[PDB]
């Protein structure tokens, strides 16, 4: 819900910048001279930035030394069919690259195997000026590096086709990270329109970083492989560590926990990592079922939670959810719902970007009169 709080960046802003340097006179000639005898080199551009340059394909050599010499000029007839096949192979990759660029207007993400093969990407990772821990982390999870990379078309001139590959840099690794799932808490009264609710809006990923917490509201952007979470710091907010206190005490005096308020009580399920939260309201029938014993639990009105140890599916109304069967340990902390604390008569509804202190101020401003 807090994705509107994020700032606006430019992902390719760096890469395009290098692309621009590539249009300056002499730069293509410099890169060409550097790769004259080698397929990998380090080149310092006019602005002084040092970049790794690689020659992945050499069509010039094949075309000018293995195709033209073997064809006659009087009644041309190629001696061998295999040559044709070889040409079709060698050109194929180039064609594919062009196709992708034409589809993506010169900026393609994720980077495909035509732009940068697995071996070339691994070699680039090995040659990057980073620590060995980062090299090991990204040498693995190569698919995530591909999904977080960009490919920018830069220039085609002086018989050289150059494009720019923009790879991620993970400066923060192995720090503790956790995920917060929130569902709605409504007072399960009988009358349809007499119910007031609250939901916490701070759902998403949190990660320790340099003494603060990086908060990613769109948990869909973050990619989870095993217990590793790859997240883009661009779509994040820097918060004090005290935000974690909101998990153990929503009314703690150190941090003001963000919440929303409403009068609509609909039943829904949030499938968490090790279980499922079920908010059952109204006449909706909510159950938890196992593939062997069938229905094993029936939820009453309110908010409940079931782990995935014995539960395989959860049915809320006409919806059926499959729970994640990832191994782990779940704990249930019993407590009085905080929704019951509020007086429905003076409860402020239809508040989206609010918090517990802001809701208290709103209630106290309704008791300004009277």
């Amino acid at each position: 819900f807090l994705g509107f709080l994020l700032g606006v960046g430019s992902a390719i802003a760096s890469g395009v910048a290098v692309s621009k340097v590539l249009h300056l006179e002499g730069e293509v000639n410099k890169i060409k001279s550097a790769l004259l005898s080698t397929n990998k080199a380090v080149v310092s551009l006019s602005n002084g930035v040092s970049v790794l340059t690689s020659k992945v394909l050499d069509l010039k050599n094949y075309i000018d030394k293995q195709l033209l010499p073997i064809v006659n000029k009087q009644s041309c007839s190629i001696p061998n069919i295999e040559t044709v096949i070889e040409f079709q192979q060698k050109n194929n990759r180039l064609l594919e690259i062009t196709r992708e660029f034409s589809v993506n207007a010169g900026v393609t993400t994720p980077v495909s195997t035509y732009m940068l093969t697995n071996s070339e990407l691994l070699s680039l990772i090995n040659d990057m000026p980073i620590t060995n821990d980062q090299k090991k982390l990204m040498s693995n999870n190569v698919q995530i590096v591909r999904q977080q990379s960009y490919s920018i078309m830069s220039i085609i001139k002086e018989e050289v086709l150059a494009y720019v590959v923009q790879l991620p840099l993970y400066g923060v690794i192995d720090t503790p990270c956790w995920k917060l799932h929130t569902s709605p808490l409504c007072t399960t009264n009988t009358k349809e329109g007499s119910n007031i609710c609250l939901t916490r809006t701070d759902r998403g990923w949190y990660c320790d970083n340099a003494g603060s917490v990086s908060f990613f509201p769109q948990a869909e952007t973050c990619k989870v492989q095993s217990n590793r979470v790859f997240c883009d710091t661009m779509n994040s907010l820097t918060l004090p560590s005290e935000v974690n206190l909101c998990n153990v005490d929503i009314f703690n005096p150190k941090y003001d926990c963000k919440i929303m308020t409403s009068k609509t009580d609909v039943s829904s399920s949030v499938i968490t990592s090790l279980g499922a939260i079920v908010s059952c309201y109204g006449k909706t029938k909510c159950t938890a079922s196992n593939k062997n014993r069938g229905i094993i639990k029936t939820f009453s009105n309110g908010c409940d939670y079931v782990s995935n140890k014995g539960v395989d599916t959860v049915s809320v109304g006409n919806t059926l959810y499959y729970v994640n069967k990832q191994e782990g340990k779940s704990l249930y902390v019993k407590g009085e719902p905080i929704i019951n604390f509020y007086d429905p008569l003076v409860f402020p509804s239809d508040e989206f970007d609010a918090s517990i202190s802001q809701v208290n101020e709103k209630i106290n401003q309704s008791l300004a009169f009277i």
Epitope: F251, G335, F341, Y342, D343
Partner: antibody, heavy 125, light 113 residues
Framework: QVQLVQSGGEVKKPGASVKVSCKAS????????ISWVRQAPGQGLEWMGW????????NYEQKFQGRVTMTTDTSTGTAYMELRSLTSDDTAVYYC??????????????????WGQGTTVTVSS | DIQLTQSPDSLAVSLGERATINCKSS????????????LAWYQQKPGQPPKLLIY???TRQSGVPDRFSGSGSGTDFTLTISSLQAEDVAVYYC?????????FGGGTKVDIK
């Protein structure tokens, strides 16, 4: 289970001071206040004071002003009530009761819904 | 302060018969922001702390038997027992939490004839 457990009874001499403990269980201690009620033998309940477990705010009875001190220990979740200059009129049973919710403004007030078992204090020679 | 008075001081009711206790306050106990009468009825037995029976104007605490009921408003309130039983022999108090200090009632003792 929401409950309050108080310390055992005490025997004191006049002019001394008495400390009564009240530990809370089954609920978040810092979300509610604690009231202290005194009951003399063969007499009705007498309210002595109320201490907020959230920020330590205290409200004492006018008769007990300057004579009774209430403290809150959030680490152990225990309310302590101390009384000084005991006389032959202090001998009574003291109860700790859970009071209004202090973390939400104008929250639902159902009164003193949870009570302690009671501590008897006898002041005699 | 708001002083509370109870009537009668002592009550004697036969088994299975209605019992009535009246509580009157020197000042109104209505909480204007939520329109609630901040009065509570407790019962106490020998060797036991008071237990909350009625809160607000007329609301029953969870687990309280349905025979106990509250009524009244403004200045006079009433606690009613539909059918007095053996276990209902206790001292009943009315107290107001509208404003500090919390003044409890004088106390009414219920006995079986």
């Amino acid at each position: 289970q929401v409950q309050l457990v108080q310390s055992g009874g005490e025997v004191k001499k006049p002019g001394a001071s008495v400390k009564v403990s009240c530990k809370a269980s089954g609920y978040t201690f810092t979300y509610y206040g604690i009231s202290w009620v005194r009951q003399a033998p063969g007499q009705g309940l007498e309210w002595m004071g109320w201490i907020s477990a959230y920020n330590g705010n205290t409200n004492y009875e006018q008769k007990f002003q300057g004579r009774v001190t209430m403290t809150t220990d959030t680490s152990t979740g225990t309310a302590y009530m101390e009384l000084r200059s005991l006389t032959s009129d202090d001998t009574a049973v003291y109860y700790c009761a859970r009071d209004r919710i202090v973390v939400v403004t104008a929250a639902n007030y159902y009164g003193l819904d949870v009570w302690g078992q009671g501590t008897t204090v006898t002041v005699s020679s | 302060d708001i002083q509370l008075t109870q009537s009668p001081d002592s009550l004697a009711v036969s088994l299975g018969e209605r019992a009535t206790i009246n509580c009157k306050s020197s000042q109104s106990v209505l909480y204007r922001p939520n329109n609630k009468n901040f009065l509570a009825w407790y019962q106490q037995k020998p060797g036991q702390p008071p237990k909350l029976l009625i809160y607000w104007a007329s609301t029953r605490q969870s687990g309280v038997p349905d025979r106990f009921s509250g009524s009244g408003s403004g200045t006079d309130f009433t606690l009613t027992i539909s059918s007095l039983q053996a276990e209902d022999v206790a001292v009943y108090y009315c107290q107001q939490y509208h404003t500090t200090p919390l003044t409890f009632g004088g106390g009414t003792k219920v006995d079986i004839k």
